[PDB]
Amino acid sequence: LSKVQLYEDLCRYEDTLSKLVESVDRFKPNLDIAKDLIRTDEALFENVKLLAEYDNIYRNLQKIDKDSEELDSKTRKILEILNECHDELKA
Amino acid sequence: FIPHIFYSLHQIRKDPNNLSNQLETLTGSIRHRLKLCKSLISENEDTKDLLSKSPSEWQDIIHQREQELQIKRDVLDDLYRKLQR
């Protein structure tokens, strides 16, 4: 799971750190910690990368939508003019 | 946003260090960076992975948008034809 797992790792990462840094209790040797704080980071990066394709499609959808709105804008812009002409001609 | 999330994660990976007043100032940033990262993840536009939407959907929305594009452009040519006329 990209996003979900991405959010779990961040949790357990902060956990492990907080212990290592002494905010919470942990036994004196406490390397398991340091090792974890590296496996988790690598997992996050890997997970984040695998997510790029998804964010790219979004990049596309944003393009498309921007276009679509721009166009509808031009159409609106023209209808305005017609009305403005209609005014100068009627009123 | 996905880029700021990458650069953000990058800076955090590079943050850990020493102890004391430093140890606290170093772990304080790590706590804020974790917040910042969680906010970016939340704000990622609904791509795939359920952050916003799956992939199946993203493909649908793209096909739906292409179709609306063809139409809005047909409308656009008509509007211009008439203005020009």
GROMACS .gro file of N, CA and C in nm:
model
  528
    1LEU      N    1   0.080  -0.120   0.000
    1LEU     CA    2   0.000   0.000   0.000
    1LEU      C    3   0.083   0.125   0.000
    2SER      N    4   0.073   0.204  -0.109
    2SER     CA    5   0.153   0.322  -0.119
    2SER      C    6   0.122   0.420  -0.009
    3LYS      N    7   0.007   0.489  -0.020
    3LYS     CA    8  -0.028   0.597   0.069
    3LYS      C    9  -0.048   0.551   0.210
    4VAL      N   10  -0.131   0.447   0.229
    4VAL     CA   11  -0.161   0.399   0.363
    4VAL      C   12  -0.030   0.361   0.433
    5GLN      N   13   0.044   0.267   0.373
    5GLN     CA   14   0.171   0.223   0.429
    5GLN      C   15   0.266   0.340   0.443
    6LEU      N   16   0.254   0.437   0.354
    6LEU     CA   17   0.341   0.552   0.360
    6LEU      C   18   0.312   0.625   0.489
    7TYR      N   19   0.186   0.625   0.531
    7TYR     CA   20   0.148   0.693   0.655
    7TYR      C   21   0.179   0.615   0.782
    8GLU      N   22   0.188   0.482   0.771
    8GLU     CA   23   0.220   0.399   0.886
    8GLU      C   24   0.368   0.411   0.915
    9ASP      N   25   0.449   0.402   0.810
    9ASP     CA   26   0.592   0.413   0.827
    9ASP      C   27   0.628   0.543   0.895
   10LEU      N   28   0.570   0.654   0.849
   10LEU     CA   29   0.604   0.782   0.909
   10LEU      C   30   0.580   0.779   1.057
   11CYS      N   31   0.474   0.710   1.097
   11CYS     CA   32   0.439   0.698   1.238
   11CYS      C   33   0.553   0.626   1.309
   12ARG      N   34   0.570   0.497   1.277
   12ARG     CA   35   0.675   0.417   1.338
   12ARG      C   36   0.816   0.478   1.322
   13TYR      N   37   0.834   0.567   1.226
   13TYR     CA   38   0.964   0.628   1.211
   13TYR      C   39   0.983   0.724   1.328
   14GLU      N   40   0.882   0.809   1.350
   14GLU     CA   41   0.887   0.907   1.457
   14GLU      C   42   0.896   0.837   1.593
   15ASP      N   43   0.834   0.719   1.601
   15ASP     CA   44   0.836   0.638   1.722
   15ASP      C   45   0.981   0.606   1.751
   16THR      N   46   1.040   0.522   1.665
   16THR     CA   47   1.180   0.481   1.675
   16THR      C   48   1.275   0.597   1.706
   17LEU      N   49   1.253   0.711   1.642
   17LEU     CA   50   1.342   0.823   1.667
   17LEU      C   51   1.328   0.869   1.811
   18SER      N   52   1.204   0.900   1.849
   18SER     CA   53   1.173   0.946   1.983
   18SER      C   54   1.236   0.855   2.090
   19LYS      N   55   1.238   0.725   2.065
   19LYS     CA   56   1.301   0.633   2.159
   19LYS      C   57   1.452   0.661   2.151
   20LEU      N   58   1.512   0.636   2.035
   20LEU     CA   59   1.654   0.659   2.018
   20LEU      C   60   1.701   0.790   2.081
   21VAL      N   61   1.629   0.898   2.054
   21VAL     CA   62   1.667   1.028   2.106
   21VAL      C   63   1.642   1.047   2.256
   22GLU      N   64   1.587   0.944   2.321
   22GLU     CA   65   1.566   0.937   2.463
   22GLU      C   66   1.436   0.995   2.510
   23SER      N   67   1.348   1.044   2.422
   23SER     CA   68   1.223   1.094   2.470
   23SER      C   69   1.151   0.981   2.537
   24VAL      N   70   1.159   0.859   2.481
   24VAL     CA   71   1.095   0.747   2.542
   24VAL      C   72   1.202   0.647   2.577
   25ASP      N   73   1.169   0.551   2.666
   25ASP     CA   74   1.266   0.458   2.717
   25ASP      C   75   1.304   0.354   2.615
   26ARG      N   76   1.432   0.312   2.619
   26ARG     CA   77   1.487   0.209   2.534
   26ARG      C   78   1.617   0.165   2.595
   27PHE      N   79   1.654   0.036   2.577
   27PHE     CA   80   1.771  -0.023   2.638
   27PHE      C   81   1.897   0.036   2.581
   28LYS      N   82   2.006   0.031   2.660
   28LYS     CA   83   2.128   0.101   2.631
   28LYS      C   84   2.193   0.066   2.500
   29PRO      N   85   2.210  -0.056   2.456
   29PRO     CA   86   2.279  -0.076   2.331
   29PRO      C   87   2.211  -0.006   2.216
   30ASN      N   88   2.082  -0.036   2.195
   30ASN     CA   89   1.990   0.027   2.105
   30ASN      C   90   2.035   0.079   1.970
   31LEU      N   91   2.070  -0.026   1.895
   31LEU     CA   92   2.108  -0.026   1.756
   31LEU      C   93   1.984  -0.074   1.679
   32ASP      N   94   1.916  -0.181   1.725
   32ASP     CA   95   1.794  -0.217   1.652
   32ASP      C   96   1.726  -0.089   1.605
   33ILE      N   97   1.721   0.010   1.694
   33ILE     CA   98   1.660   0.138   1.663
   33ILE      C   99   1.722   0.197   1.538
   34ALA      N  100   1.848   0.239   1.549
   34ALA     CA  101   1.919   0.299   1.436
   34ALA      C  102   1.901   0.220   1.308
   35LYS      N  103   1.903   0.088   1.316
   35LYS     CA  104   1.885   0.010   1.196
   35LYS      C  105   1.744   0.032   1.141
   36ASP      N  106   1.643   0.034   1.229
   36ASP     CA  107   1.505   0.056   1.186
   36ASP      C  108   1.488   0.192   1.121
   37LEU      N  109   1.544   0.293   1.185
   37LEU     CA  110   1.535   0.429   1.136
   37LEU      C  111   1.601   0.446   0.999
   38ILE      N  112   1.652   0.337   0.942
   38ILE     CA  113   1.714   0.342   0.810
   38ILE      C  114   1.635   0.256   0.713
   39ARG      N  115   1.582   0.145   0.762
   39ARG     CA  116   1.501   0.059   0.679
   39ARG      C  117   1.372   0.133   0.647
   40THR      N  118   1.315   0.195   0.750
   40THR     CA  119   1.192   0.270   0.732
   40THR      C  120   1.213   0.382   0.631
   41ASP      N  121   1.318   0.461   0.647
   41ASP     CA  122   1.343   0.570   0.553
   41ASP      C  123   1.356   0.519   0.409
   42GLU      N  124   1.428   0.410   0.389
   42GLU     CA  125   1.441   0.356   0.255
   42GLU      C  126   1.304   0.313   0.204
   43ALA      N  127   1.226   0.246   0.288
   43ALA     CA  128   1.092   0.203   0.249
   43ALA      C  129   1.004   0.320   0.207
   44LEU      N  130   1.016   0.431   0.279
   44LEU     CA  131   0.938   0.549   0.248
   44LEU      C  132   0.975   0.600   0.109
   45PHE      N  133   1.103   0.623   0.086
   45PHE     CA  134   1.149   0.669  -0.044
   45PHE      C  135   1.099   0.578  -0.156
   46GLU      N  136   1.123   0.447  -0.143
   46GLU     CA  137   1.078   0.352  -0.244
   46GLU      C  138   0.929   0.371  -0.266
   47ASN      N  139   0.853   0.371  -0.158
   47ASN     CA  140   0.709   0.386  -0.165
   47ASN      C  141   0.671   0.517  -0.233
   48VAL      N  142   0.737   0.625  -0.196
   48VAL     CA  143   0.706   0.754  -0.256
   48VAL      C  144   0.728   0.750  -0.407
   49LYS      N  145   0.840   0.694  -0.451
   49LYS     CA  146   0.871   0.683  -0.594
   49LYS      C  147   0.761   0.610  -0.670
   50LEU      N  148   0.726   0.492  -0.622
   50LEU     CA  149   0.622   0.414  -0.686
   50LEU      C  150   0.493   0.494  -0.705
   51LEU      N  151   0.482   0.605  -0.632
   51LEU     CA  152   0.362   0.687  -0.639
   51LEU      C  153   0.362   0.790  -0.751
   52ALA      N  154   0.479   0.814  -0.811
   52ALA     CA  155   0.492   0.915  -0.917
   52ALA      C  156   0.393   0.905  -1.033
   53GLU      N  157   0.378   0.785  -1.089
   53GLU     CA  158   0.285   0.765  -1.201
   53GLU      C  159   0.149   0.825  -1.166
   54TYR      N  160   0.100   0.795  -1.047
   54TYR     CA  161  -0.029   0.846  -1.002
   54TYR      C  162  -0.032   0.999  -1.005
   55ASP      N  163   0.071   1.061  -0.949
   55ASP     CA  164   0.076   1.206  -0.946
   55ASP      C  165   0.099   1.268  -1.081
   56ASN      N  166   0.144   1.187  -1.178
   56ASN     CA  167   0.166   1.237  -1.313
   56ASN      C  168   0.031   1.244  -1.384
   57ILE      N  169  -0.048   1.138  -1.373
   57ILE     CA  170  -0.180   1.137  -1.433
   57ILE      C  171  -0.251   1.262  -1.382
   58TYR      N  172  -0.237   1.290  -1.253
   58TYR     CA  173  -0.299   1.407  -1.195
   58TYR      C  174  -0.248   1.533  -1.264
   59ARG      N  175  -0.120   1.532  -1.298
   59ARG     CA  176  -0.058   1.645  -1.364
   59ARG      C  177  -0.127   1.664  -1.497
   60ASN      N  178  -0.159   1.553  -1.562
   60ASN     CA  179  -0.225   1.558  -1.691
   60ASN      C  180  -0.366   1.614  -1.673
   61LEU      N  181  -0.442   1.552  -1.583
   61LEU     CA  182  -0.578   1.594  -1.557
   61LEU      C  183  -0.583   1.742  -1.527
   62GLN      N  184  -0.477   1.795  -1.468
   62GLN     CA  185  -0.478   1.936  -1.437
   62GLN      C  186  -0.461   2.017  -1.563
   63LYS      N  187  -0.380   1.965  -1.655
   63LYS     CA  188  -0.356   2.031  -1.783
   63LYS      C  189  -0.491   2.036  -1.852
   64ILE      N  190  -0.544   1.917  -1.884
   64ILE     CA  191  -0.672   1.905  -1.951
   64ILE      C  192  -0.775   2.000  -1.894
   65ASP      N  193  -0.798   1.992  -1.764
   65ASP     CA  194  -0.895   2.079  -1.701
   65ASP      C  195  -0.864   2.226  -1.721
   66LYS      N  196  -0.737   2.263  -1.711
   66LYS     CA  197  -0.701   2.402  -1.730
   66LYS      C  198  -0.743   2.443  -1.870
   67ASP      N  199  -0.711   2.357  -1.967
   67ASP     CA  200  -0.747   2.384  -2.106
   67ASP      C  201  -0.896   2.406  -2.114
   68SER      N  202  -0.970   2.301  -2.081
   68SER     CA  203  -1.114   2.305  -2.085
   68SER      C  204  -1.170   2.436  -2.030
   69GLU      N  205  -1.122   2.480  -1.915
   69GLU     CA  206  -1.174   2.604  -1.859
   69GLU      C  207  -1.134   2.722  -1.946
   70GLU      N  208  -1.011   2.723  -1.994
   70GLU     CA  209  -0.966   2.833  -2.078
   70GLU      C  210  -1.056   2.849  -2.200
   71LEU      N  211  -1.087   2.736  -2.264
   71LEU     CA  212  -1.172   2.735  -2.382
   71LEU      C  213  -1.309   2.792  -2.349
   72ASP      N  214  -1.376   2.731  -2.252
   72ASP     CA  215  -1.507   2.778  -2.212
   72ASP      C  216  -1.499   2.927  -2.184
   73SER      N  217  -1.379   2.973  -2.149
   73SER     CA  218  -1.363   3.113  -2.121
   73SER      C  219  -1.378   3.192  -2.248
   74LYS      N  220  -1.306   3.150  -2.351
   74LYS     CA  221  -1.311   3.216  -2.481
   74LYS      C  222  -1.453   3.219  -2.536
   75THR      N  223  -1.525   3.109  -2.520
   75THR     CA  224  -1.662   3.107  -2.568
   75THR      C  225  -1.740   3.215  -2.493
   76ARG      N  226  -1.730   3.216  -2.360
   76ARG     CA  227  -1.799   3.316  -2.280
   76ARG      C  228  -1.760   3.455  -2.327
   77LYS      N  229  -1.630   3.477  -2.339
   77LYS     CA  230  -1.578   3.605  -2.381
   77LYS      C  231  -1.645   3.656  -2.510
   78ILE      N  232  -1.676   3.566  -2.602
   78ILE     CA  233  -1.740   3.603  -2.728
   78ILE      C  234  -1.888   3.636  -2.709
   79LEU      N  235  -1.958   3.554  -2.631
   79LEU     CA  236  -2.099   3.577  -2.605
   79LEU      C  237  -2.115   3.717  -2.544
   80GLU      N  238  -2.020   3.755  -2.458
   80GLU     CA  239  -2.025   3.887  -2.396
   80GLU      C  240  -2.034   3.990  -2.507
   81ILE      N  241  -1.929   3.994  -2.588
   81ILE     CA  242  -1.917   4.086  -2.700
   81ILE      C  243  -2.047   4.095  -2.779
   82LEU      N  244  -2.106   3.981  -2.812
   82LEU     CA  245  -2.231   3.984  -2.887
   82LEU      C  246  -2.332   4.069  -2.811
   83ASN      N  247  -2.348   4.042  -2.681
   83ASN     CA  248  -2.442   4.118  -2.599
   83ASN      C  249  -2.407   4.267  -2.597
   84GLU      N  250  -2.279   4.298  -2.579
   84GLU     CA  251  -2.236   4.437  -2.578
   84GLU      C  252  -2.273   4.502  -2.711
   85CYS      N  253  -2.254   4.431  -2.821
   85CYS     CA  254  -2.290   4.485  -2.951
   85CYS      C  255  -2.441   4.509  -2.946
   86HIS      N  256  -2.515   4.406  -2.910
   86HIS     CA  257  -2.660   4.415  -2.900
   86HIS      C  258  -2.703   4.540  -2.823
   87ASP      N  259  -2.630   4.573  -2.717
   87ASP     CA  260  -2.663   4.692  -2.640
   87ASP      C  261  -2.642   4.816  -2.725
   88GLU      N  262  -2.517   4.841  -2.765
   88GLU     CA  263  -2.486   4.957  -2.848
   88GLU      C  264  -2.585   4.972  -2.962
   89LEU      N  265  -2.646   4.861  -3.003
   89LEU     CA  266  -2.740   4.865  -3.113
   89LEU      C  267  -2.884   4.888  -3.067
   90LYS      N  268  -2.923   4.827  -2.956
   90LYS     CA  269  -3.058   4.843  -2.905
   90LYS      C  270  -3.070   4.964  -2.812
   91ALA      N  271  -3.011   4.956  -2.694
   91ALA     CA  272  -3.017   5.066  -2.597
   91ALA      C  273  -2.935   5.188  -2.639
   92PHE      N  274   0.320   1.967  -0.577
   92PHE     CA  275   0.308   1.911  -0.442
   92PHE      C  276   0.383   1.783  -0.428
   93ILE      N  277   0.376   1.695  -0.526
   93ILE     CA  278   0.447   1.569  -0.515
   93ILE      C  279   0.597   1.595  -0.512
   94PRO      N  280   0.640   1.696  -0.587
   94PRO     CA  281   0.780   1.741  -0.587
   94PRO      C  282   0.824   1.800  -0.451
   95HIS      N  283   0.739   1.882  -0.387
   95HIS     CA  284   0.770   1.940  -0.257
   95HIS      C  285   0.772   1.827  -0.153
   96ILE      N  286   0.692   1.722  -0.176
   96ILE     CA  287   0.692   1.610  -0.083
   96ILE      C  288   0.826   1.536  -0.097
   97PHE      N  289   0.876   1.524  -0.220
   97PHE     CA  290   1.004   1.456  -0.241
   97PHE      C  291   1.118   1.535  -0.180
   98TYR      N  292   1.123   1.664  -0.210
   98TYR     CA  293   1.227   1.749  -0.157
   98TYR      C  294   1.220   1.755  -0.005
   99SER      N  295   1.098   1.752   0.048
   99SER     CA  296   1.079   1.756   0.192
   99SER      C  297   1.136   1.628   0.252
  100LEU      N  298   1.090   1.513   0.204
  100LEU     CA  299   1.139   1.386   0.254
  100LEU      C  300   1.291   1.383   0.244
  101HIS      N  301   1.344   1.440   0.136
  101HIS     CA  302   1.489   1.443   0.116
  101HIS      C  303   1.559   1.514   0.232
  102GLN      N  304   1.511   1.634   0.266
  102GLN     CA  305   1.569   1.712   0.375
  102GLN      C  306   1.559   1.641   0.509
  103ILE      N  307   1.451   1.568   0.531
  103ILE     CA  308   1.436   1.499   0.658
  103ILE      C  309   1.536   1.384   0.666
  104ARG      N  310   1.550   1.309   0.557
  104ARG     CA  311   1.644   1.197   0.554
  104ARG      C  312   1.782   1.247   0.595
  105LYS      N  313   1.815   1.367   0.549
  105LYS     CA  314   1.944   1.427   0.579
  105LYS      C  315   1.953   1.498   0.714
  106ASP      N  316   1.843   1.509   0.789
  106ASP     CA  317   1.855   1.581   0.915
  106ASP      C  318   1.921   1.516   1.036
  107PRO      N  319   1.908   1.392   1.075
  107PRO     CA  320   1.955   1.347   1.206
  107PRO      C  321   2.097   1.382   1.249
  108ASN      N  322   2.119   1.414   1.380
  108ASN     CA  323   2.251   1.445   1.432
  108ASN      C  324   2.263   1.428   1.583
  109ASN      N  325   2.348   1.513   1.647
  109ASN     CA  326   2.398   1.512   1.784
  109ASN      C  327   2.298   1.544   1.893
  110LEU      N  328   2.347   1.544   2.021
  110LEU     CA  329   2.266   1.556   2.140
  110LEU      C  330   2.299   1.674   2.232
  111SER      N  331   2.198   1.715   2.309
  111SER     CA  332   2.210   1.827   2.400
  111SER      C  333   2.105   1.928   2.354
  112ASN      N  334   2.140   2.057   2.366
  112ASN     CA  335   2.053   2.166   2.321
  112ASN      C  336   2.038   2.137   2.174
  113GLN      N  337   2.149   2.098   2.111
  113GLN     CA  338   2.142   2.056   1.972
  113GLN      C  339   2.049   1.938   1.953
  114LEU      N  340   2.070   1.831   2.029
  114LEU     CA  341   1.985   1.713   2.017
  114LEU      C  342   1.836   1.749   2.015
  115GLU      N  343   1.799   1.852   2.091
  115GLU     CA  344   1.659   1.895   2.096
  115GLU      C  345   1.621   1.978   1.975
  116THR      N  346   1.710   2.067   1.934
  116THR     CA  347   1.684   2.151   1.817
  116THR      C  348   1.685   2.066   1.690
  117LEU      N  349   1.756   1.954   1.693
  117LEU     CA  350   1.764   1.863   1.578
  117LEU      C  351   1.641   1.774   1.573
  118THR      N  352   1.591   1.737   1.690
  118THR     CA  353   1.474   1.652   1.699
  118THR      C  354   1.346   1.735   1.692
  119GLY      N  355   1.358   1.865   1.712
  119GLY     CA  356   1.241   1.952   1.703
  119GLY      C  357   1.204   1.971   1.556
  120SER      N  358   1.306   1.989   1.472
  120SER     CA  359   1.285   2.008   1.330
  120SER      C  360   1.229   1.880   1.272
  121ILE      N  361   1.281   1.766   1.317
  121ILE     CA  362   1.234   1.636   1.270
  121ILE      C  363   1.086   1.617   1.302
  122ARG      N  364   1.040   1.676   1.411
  122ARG     CA  365   0.899   1.663   1.446
  122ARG      C  366   0.814   1.752   1.356
  123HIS      N  367   0.864   1.871   1.324
  123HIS     CA  368   0.791   1.962   1.238
  123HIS      C  369   0.790   1.910   1.093
  124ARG      N  370   0.904   1.858   1.050
  124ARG     CA  371   0.916   1.802   0.916
  124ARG      C  372   0.819   1.686   0.901
  125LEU      N  373   0.793   1.614   1.009
  125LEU     CA  374   0.702   1.501   1.000
  125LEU      C  375   0.560   1.551   0.983
  126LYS      N  376   0.532   1.668   1.040
  126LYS     CA  377   0.399   1.726   1.030
  126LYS      C  378   0.384   1.776   0.886
  127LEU      N  379   0.480   1.857   0.845
  127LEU     CA  380   0.481   1.910   0.710
  127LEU      C  381   0.461   1.799   0.607
  128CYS      N  382   0.535   1.690   0.622
  128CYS     CA  383   0.522   1.581   0.528
  128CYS      C  384   0.383   1.521   0.529
  129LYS      N  385   0.326   1.502   0.647
  129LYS     CA  386   0.192   1.445   0.655
  129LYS      C  387   0.089   1.539   0.591
  130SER      N  388   0.111   1.670   0.601
  130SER     CA  389   0.019   1.765   0.538
  130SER      C  390   0.031   1.758   0.385
  131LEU      N  391   0.154   1.752   0.334
  131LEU     CA  392   0.175   1.741   0.190
  131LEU      C  393   0.104   1.614   0.143
  132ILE      N  394   0.133   1.502   0.206
  132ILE     CA  395   0.067   1.380   0.165
  132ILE      C  396  -0.083   1.400   0.160
  133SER      N  397  -0.138   1.470   0.259
  133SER     CA  398  -0.283   1.491   0.260
  133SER      C  399  -0.326   1.573   0.140
  134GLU      N  400  -0.248   1.676   0.106
  134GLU     CA  401  -0.280   1.765  -0.005
  134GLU      C  402  -0.246   1.711  -0.144
  135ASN      N  403  -0.187   1.592  -0.152
  135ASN     CA  404  -0.158   1.540  -0.285
  135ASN      C  405  -0.291   1.526  -0.358
  136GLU      N  406  -0.295   1.574  -0.484
  136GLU     CA  407  -0.416   1.570  -0.562
  136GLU      C  408  -0.446   1.426  -0.586
  137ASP      N  409  -0.577   1.392  -0.583
  137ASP     CA  410  -0.624   1.256  -0.586
  137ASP      C  411  -0.583   1.179  -0.705
  138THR      N  412  -0.460   1.126  -0.703
  138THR     CA  413  -0.404   1.049  -0.811
  138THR      C  414  -0.449   0.908  -0.791
  139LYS      N  415  -0.353   0.812  -0.792
  139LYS     CA  416  -0.379   0.673  -0.769
  139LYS      C  417  -0.336   0.645  -0.628
  140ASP      N  418  -0.364   0.523  -0.581
  140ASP     CA  419  -0.326   0.481  -0.447
  140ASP      C  420  -0.428   0.522  -0.341
  141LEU      N  421  -0.536   0.585  -0.387
  141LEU     CA  422  -0.643   0.628  -0.298
  141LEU      C  423  -0.612   0.759  -0.226
  142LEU      N  424  -0.500   0.822  -0.259
  142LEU     CA  425  -0.467   0.949  -0.195
  142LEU      C  426  -0.578   1.044  -0.235
  143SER      N  427  -0.614   1.038  -0.363
  143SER     CA  428  -0.722   1.118  -0.418
  143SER      C  429  -0.821   1.019  -0.477
  144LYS      N  430  -0.769   0.935  -0.566
  144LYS     CA  431  -0.848   0.831  -0.632
  144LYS      C  432  -0.757   0.722  -0.688
  145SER      N  433  -0.813   0.605  -0.714
  145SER     CA  434  -0.738   0.493  -0.771
  145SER      C  435  -0.685   0.526  -0.909
  146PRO      N  436  -0.633   0.425  -0.978
  146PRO     CA  437  -0.580   0.445  -1.112
  146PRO      C  438  -0.697   0.432  -1.208
  147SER      N  439  -0.775   0.325  -1.193
  147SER     CA  440  -0.890   0.302  -1.279
  147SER      C  441  -0.968   0.431  -1.300
  148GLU      N  442  -0.992   0.504  -1.192
  148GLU     CA  443  -1.065   0.629  -1.201
  148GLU      C  444  -0.988   0.734  -1.277
  149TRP      N  445  -0.859   0.747  -1.247
  149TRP     CA  446  -0.779   0.851  -1.308
  149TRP      C  447  -0.784   0.836  -1.458
  150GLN      N  448  -0.781   0.712  -1.505
  150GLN     CA  449  -0.791   0.687  -1.649
  150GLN      C  450  -0.929   0.730  -1.699
  151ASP      N  451  -1.035   0.706  -1.620
  151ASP     CA  452  -1.168   0.744  -1.666
  151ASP      C  453  -1.176   0.895  -1.679
  152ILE      N  454  -1.134   0.965  -1.575
  152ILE     CA  455  -1.140   1.110  -1.576
  152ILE      C  456  -1.061   1.170  -1.692
  153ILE      N  457  -0.958   1.100  -1.736
  153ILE     CA  458  -0.878   1.151  -1.847
  153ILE      C  459  -0.954   1.133  -1.978
  154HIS      N  460  -1.023   1.020  -1.992
  154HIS     CA  461  -1.100   0.995  -2.112
  154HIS      C  462  -1.220   1.088  -2.115
  155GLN      N  463  -1.279   1.111  -1.998
  155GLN     CA  464  -1.394   1.198  -1.990
  155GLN      C  465  -1.353   1.340  -2.027
  156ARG      N  466  -1.235   1.382  -1.984
  156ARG     CA  467  -1.187   1.516  -2.014
  156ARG      C  468  -1.151   1.534  -2.161
  157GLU      N  469  -1.097   1.430  -2.223
  157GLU     CA  470  -1.061   1.441  -2.363
  157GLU      C  471  -1.189   1.458  -2.444
  158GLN      N  472  -1.291   1.382  -2.409
  158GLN     CA  473  -1.418   1.392  -2.479
  158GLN      C  474  -1.477   1.533  -2.463
  159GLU      N  475  -1.479   1.584  -2.341
  159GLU     CA  476  -1.531   1.718  -2.323
  159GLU      C  477  -1.448   1.821  -2.399
  160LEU      N  478  -1.321   1.789  -2.422
  160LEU     CA  479  -1.234   1.882  -2.494
  160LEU      C  480  -1.279   1.893  -2.639
  161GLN      N  481  -1.301   1.777  -2.701
  161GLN     CA  482  -1.346   1.771  -2.839
  161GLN      C  483  -1.473   1.854  -2.853
  162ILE      N  484  -1.564   1.838  -2.758
  162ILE     CA  485  -1.690   1.911  -2.761
  162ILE      C  486  -1.671   2.060  -2.743
  163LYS      N  487  -1.606   2.100  -2.635
  163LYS     CA  488  -1.585   2.242  -2.611
  163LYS      C  489  -1.513   2.309  -2.726
  164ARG      N  490  -1.442   2.232  -2.806
  164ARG     CA  491  -1.373   2.295  -2.917
  164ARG      C  492  -1.468   2.308  -3.035
  165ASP      N  493  -1.564   2.216  -3.043
  165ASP     CA  494  -1.664   2.221  -3.149
  165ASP      C  495  -1.751   2.344  -3.119
  166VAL      N  496  -1.776   2.368  -2.991
  166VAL     CA  497  -1.854   2.483  -2.951
  166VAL      C  498  -1.777   2.608  -2.988
  167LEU      N  499  -1.647   2.603  -2.961
  167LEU     CA  500  -1.559   2.717  -2.985
  167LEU      C  501  -1.553   2.757  -3.132
  168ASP      N  502  -1.552   2.658  -3.221
  168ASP     CA  503  -1.543   2.690  -3.364
  168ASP      C  504  -1.673   2.759  -3.406
  169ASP      N  505  -1.785   2.707  -3.356
  169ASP     CA  506  -1.916   2.763  -3.385
  169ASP      C  507  -1.925   2.907  -3.337
  170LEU      N  508  -1.884   2.931  -3.214
  170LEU     CA  509  -1.888   3.065  -3.159
  170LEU      C  510  -1.806   3.159  -3.245
  171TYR      N  511  -1.689   3.114  -3.289
  171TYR     CA  512  -1.605   3.199  -3.372
  171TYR      C  513  -1.665   3.218  -3.511
  172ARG      N  514  -1.714   3.110  -3.570
  172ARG     CA  515  -1.777   3.118  -3.701
  172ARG      C  516  -1.874   3.236  -3.696
  173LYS      N  517  -1.972   3.227  -3.606
  173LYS     CA  518  -2.074   3.329  -3.590
  173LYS      C  519  -2.020   3.469  -3.563
  174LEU      N  520  -1.925   3.482  -3.471
  174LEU     CA  521  -1.872   3.615  -3.446
  174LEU      C  522  -1.820   3.671  -3.578
  175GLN      N  523  -1.736   3.592  -3.645
  175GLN     CA  524  -1.678   3.631  -3.774
  175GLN      C  525  -1.785   3.662  -3.879
  176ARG      N  526  -1.891   3.581  -3.882
  176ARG     CA  527  -2.000   3.601  -3.978
  176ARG      C  528  -2.065   3.737  -3.956
   0.00000   0.00000   0.00000
